[PDB]
Amino acid sequence: QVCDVFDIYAICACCKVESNEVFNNYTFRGLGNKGVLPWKCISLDMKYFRAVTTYVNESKYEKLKYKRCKYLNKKLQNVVVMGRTNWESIPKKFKPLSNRINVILSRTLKKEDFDEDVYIINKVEDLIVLLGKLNYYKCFILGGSVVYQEFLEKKLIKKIYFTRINSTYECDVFFPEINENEYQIISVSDVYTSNNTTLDFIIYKKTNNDDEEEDDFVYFNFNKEKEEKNKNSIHPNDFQIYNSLKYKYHPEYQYLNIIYDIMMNGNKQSDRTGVGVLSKFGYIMKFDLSQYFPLLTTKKLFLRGIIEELLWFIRGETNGNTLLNKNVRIWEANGTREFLDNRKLFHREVNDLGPIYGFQWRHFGAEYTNMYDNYENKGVDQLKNIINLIKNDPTSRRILLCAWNVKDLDQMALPPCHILCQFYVFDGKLSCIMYQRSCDLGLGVPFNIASYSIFTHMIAQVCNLQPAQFIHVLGNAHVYNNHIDSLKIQLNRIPYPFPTLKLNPDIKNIEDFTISDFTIQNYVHHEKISMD
Amino acid sequence: QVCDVFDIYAICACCKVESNEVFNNYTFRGLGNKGVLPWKCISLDMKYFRAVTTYVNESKYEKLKYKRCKYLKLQNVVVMGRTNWESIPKKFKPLSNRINVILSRTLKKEDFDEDVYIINKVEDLIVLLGKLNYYKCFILGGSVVYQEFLEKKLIKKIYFTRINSTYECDVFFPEINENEYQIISVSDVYTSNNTTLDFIIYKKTNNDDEEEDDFVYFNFNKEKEEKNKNSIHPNDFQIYNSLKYKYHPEYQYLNIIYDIMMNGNKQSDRTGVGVLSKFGYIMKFDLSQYFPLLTTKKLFLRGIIEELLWFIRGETNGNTLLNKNVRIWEANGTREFLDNRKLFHREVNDLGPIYGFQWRHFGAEYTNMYDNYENKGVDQLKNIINLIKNDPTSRRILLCAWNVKDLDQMALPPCHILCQFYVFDGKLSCIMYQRSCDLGLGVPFNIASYSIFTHMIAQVCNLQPAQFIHVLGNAHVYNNHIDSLKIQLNRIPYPFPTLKLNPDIKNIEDFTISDFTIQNYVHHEKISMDM
């Protein structure tokens, strides 16, 4: 087909347009405004644009030339193709585009109307003629909307390098609705921040609808048991989309790939109640908090409850009623008469959760009495101490906050799942490890990622640091049997660019945050999944 | 040369021989004994030798069809000396799916078995390959055949199995000329028929590709050569960098050292000492397949085994160790060091409520290293053992030394924060979270300690040890270890040893130093980590 021989790709960038919100991939569709771009600079998009439209590989040229010659019977650079208004949006000092063979479609304008060193063509068949005559690597359609429309309805695009700008702007022109039958996404990049917006890079593909060391690889894999056994009784063919992607570089896939790993390779166990899980042991996930807030996109997540849990912890509280009166039910089941009695806490009042996270963070080692006691200057204020070590001894390898008080375990409603946070400071940035002994991949983890990411931002702010990495170590990583079906749905979804977290900048002590100091901007997500 | 053109390869397997001793590649030489192999059956090698000698690639034969004939079902060639031929029994003859050559100057094709081949002098092969259609030519020994093939530089690659046990031998492999061949791949380590083994690859020295440009675009925001912050010199690790396949588990430790040296943050800890630092790693070692005692330098375990026994007894008394010449904690018990920790009222070598005390007495008011603490505080060690036996699917099997109440009273706060255990199908795994990781001195020992512990816990619980999982928090190279580790990165690991515990010990409290034995430890020379 014409676009496979001449290697004609589209590259574009689309913001969200000003229209319980439904999100699909038509969410990213805004192209330009009043004949320019809807944003000022997004330098990372330019850097990427520059990299795709200028990259050439001379070794691959020999096969492209042959291929092209065969379909015709018979310093290397790429061609870029522009609508006239696209071309007129470009600052003069940057035209023609350096190190690229510039082509401009126009009727109003002819060869004579240009000083530059550009090919002017009347019409699309004129690009195909030209490409049969030029030595060039790849041909990229640079827009705008009219050029994009005509190139897709002529089935002349092999791939779309589509940048998702995860902010909203005023737009007067739009990228056409991509037909899912015609194009599927095969690759999704890492998520970055540039110019106060997150973005990622996705690739749509035209649909179906020394090399002795090649061999040493196979010799060296001689003992591998699983040769399509169905190790666990989940069917790869149900993860069609998940498996069809080639480059899964969105950080959400750090979480998604562990659910794949647990499902394909998990050990079958009957846990605390008889419920049943697949389980694995030891994983690490790293999220770049300077580039995004890793709220999972492949299902809807509300953070009001877990933000109010984090503030409850920081205040040192163990009173389950405080959450209940803010309509947060996170701890309700763990405070019942029955639940407490079955934990042999017969002398513990309903919703008095005992010496849990808050108590240990502000008072580790004090004798716990009841949820209403004044524990001032009793036991160790770990939280205060770790803020003090970040500020005054940032290179310490001893900045840990530990919830696992061995003496108090049996007196807690339940022993903590988030065992400990360690902190690390280099060059004015704060990174955090949280070690989780016990990890519900379907229900718990996605919230836990959020709690500790928010907490790291908070500790960074009050210490006058920027956040860097939030690092999540999973000990006992389990998927409950009755989550599996929901999880196979979620895995076949393709993540959206992460949102961002904004903390009220004025809060300077860790104690001084409230619910209104927390804003999640630009949360684009698939619909909610009931995991059960 | 003949060899690089015609793809002439040697597959062999060499054990150690029955000769404070020193190791090199020529440690592994034993080939045969009394016209048979020196060992009963090592079936993971039998399997390897099958997969390697059968397998062929249709696609890639093209670049050979026109190269050996640009010089003058597609099976594989195997050559063997008659005694290597008759050394094997009959049901296997002639090795299925393989052009069975033999190197005999005596008995001809009418003498011998099936519809195979023969030659009579070394040269007489040179042209036989030039005739028939074949993927690659494998020399299966024996010593005599290998010997005369390495003399005449006809061997492109050697596919050499290191059998890491000792056997009676009569025949050996040639010393591999270190300047004439170099190792370019090393496999995972495996247990098989009560011995560890790995597979290494020697080479002759010289003195849908659209989705491939998408990879370059996704790397658009990565980093070049002033980026990759290196006053380290990559070219100083030629051997580390020349390996294609680095599958030996020691590479889990080595790769972290390379990562820290190359991408490490320069920081100036306490003193002005200087480190390169990163945050958050996870290594995993299969205790069922080997004992992960680093082989790229010499490690001693008596001291760290005594330390472990000392922990299990609940001791905090530094003198107990000093009287056994284990001096791991000596610096942390001086009047000077205690005074600088603001512990002016602590006896010298009274290390305070450290590992032992937290493991057997968590929450007990520490008094001094001589007090009787029986049935005071939480015996976590007894508890986590009773959890493994009574409730193995529990996700609460944690052994934690980081008592926040007691940190200031400790000579120093622990590096090893906690162990977590996991039991599946009668097998025990252990995660240890290390807050502070000296990759050059500490970590090598810390792996051995907690590997040993895992074996101890597993055995007193009648489980097989599975994985030790080492999670590193603040991982640092001391700046002055850099020269030594560069030397260390350029050493090819040896197949790991094994650990044998005295099987009689079924109480964690009942181990003594003589119940621990390391077997077949083959290691490069000791390295002083500075100077």
Ligand SMILES: NC(=O)C1=CN([C@@H]2O[C@H](COP(=O)(O)OP(=O)(O)OC[C@H]3O[C@@H](n4cnc5c(N)ncnc54)[C@H](OP(=O)(O)O)[C@@H]3O)[C@@H](O)[C@H]2O)C=CC1
């Ligand atoms: N976000 C992004 O990735 C991109 C955004 N943009 C934005 O897009 C907008 C411009 O798009 P839009 O207004 O649709 O216009 P275009 O940039 O697509 O240019 C349209 C003009 O191109 C010429 N033309 C197009 N097709 C043909 C053809 N087949 N034969 C001959 N001439 C042809 C005509 O020029 P003439 O009128 O002289 O005959 C036509 O008026 C701006 O806002 C721009 O900044 C630009 C590209 C990429």
Ligand SMILES: NC(=O)C1=CN([C@@H]2O[C@H](COP(=O)(O)OP(=O)(O)OC[C@H]3O[C@@H](n4cnc5c(N)ncnc54)[C@H](OP(=O)(O)O)[C@@H]3O)[C@@H](O)[C@H]2O)C=CC1
């Ligand atoms: N561990 C390992 O990797 C392996 C080692 N072995 C072991 O090795 C031992 C046998 O090896 P080894 O003693 O070296 O004997 P070989 O198996 O190497 O057989 C060599 C024979 O080939 C003939 N021959 C030797 N040199 C030449 C030559 N230049 N030209 C032509 N023919 C020649 C001779 O047979 P003749 O003159 O009688 O015709 C000679 O006896 C056994 O213990 C066996 O189990 C076996 C397989 C692999």
Ligand SMILES: CC1(C)N=C(N)N=C(N)N1OCCCN(Cc1ccccc1)c1ccc(Cl)cc1
């Ligand atoms: C730049 C942009 C939006 N990014 C992607 N990913 N895909 C595109 N097609 N893009 O538009 C390219 C249009 C050309 N352009 C339009 C432009 C750029 C800046 C300001 C106004 C208009 C430009 C100008 C200068 C240089 Cl050096 C390179 C490209």
Ligand SMILES: CC1(C)N=C(N)N=C(N)N1OCCCN(Cc1ccccc1)c1ccc(Cl)cc1
């Ligand atoms: C088997 C061995 C040692 N494996 C490696 N890695 N390197 C070699 N070249 N080997 O030599 C194999 C030669 C003969 N042999 C070894 C043998 C077997 C039984 C008793 C003595 C020797 C054999 C028998 C059956 C089969 Cl299917 C394949 C090889």
Ligand SMILES: O=c1ccn([C@H]2C[C@H](O)[C@@H](COP(=O)(O)O)O2)c(=O)[nH]1
């Ligand atoms: O913050 C939390 C709290 C709980 N859990 C899950 C993990 C287990 O499924 C269960 C805890 O049960 P135990 O591991 O304590 O038995 O709750 C989480 O994932 N995150």
Ligand SMILES: O=c1ccn([C@H]2C[C@H](O)[C@@H](COP(=O)(O)O)O2)c(=O)[nH]1
């Ligand atoms: O078992 C141990 C004890 C110490 N260290 C290293 C880490 C640091 O270099 C130093 C401990 O000092 P702090 O991290 O507590 O400052 O020793 C280890 O790697 N392992």
